[PDB]
Amino acid sequence: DEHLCANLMQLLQESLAQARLGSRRPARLLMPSQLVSQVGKELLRLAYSEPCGLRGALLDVCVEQGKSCHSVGQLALDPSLVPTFQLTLVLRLDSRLWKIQGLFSSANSPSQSLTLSTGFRVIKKKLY
């Protein structure tokens, strides 16, 4: 499942690069190189005790922003299988990186990226 997971990490970063956390305004969220590695490792660890391994997983991603927890997206890891377990990935964005843009920001220069924390959680639950 290692190549499946590597590819998933790529899809995840593409997703986070245009994340919407509570509004329509996308934010360019970046995963530290270490986070990508640790996340992948843990997803794999949790999946190997399941039928079909990581292929049977439904990945559920959210980003912690202070007290809030924003849903980023959800993905069945293999289109030809019905997911039988859910992996909830909880990432974190330091709240100083968090403001309101205004209605007249067109001539503003492109937003900078925001790098996510190295801390995260993964929770697995069987689906029925």
Is residue 5 within 8 Å of 54, Cβ to Cβ?
yes
What is the separation of C-alpha 15 from the centre of its chain, rounded to a whole number of angstroms? 7
Q: Take residue 110 and report the two structure tokens written for it.
A: 């492109």
List of residues 6+ apart from 19 with CB closer than 8 A: 26, 27, 28, 29, 63, 70, 72
DSSP-based helix, strand, coil % in the chain, nearest 5: 25, 30, 40
Specify the amino acid at residue 84. Answer: T
DSSP 64-92: EETTEEEEEEEEES-TTS---EEEEEEEE
Domain ranges of the chain: 1-128
Which structural technique was applied?
X-ray
Task: Answer for the pair 120, 35: CB distance below 8 angstroms, yes or no.
Answer: yes
Provide the CATH number for the domain formed by 1-128 in this structure. Answer: 3.90.470.40
Experimental resolution (Å): 2.0
- Spatial CA neighbour of 81 closest among 106, 58, 115: 58
Q: Are 35 and 116 in contact (CB under 8 A)?
A: yes
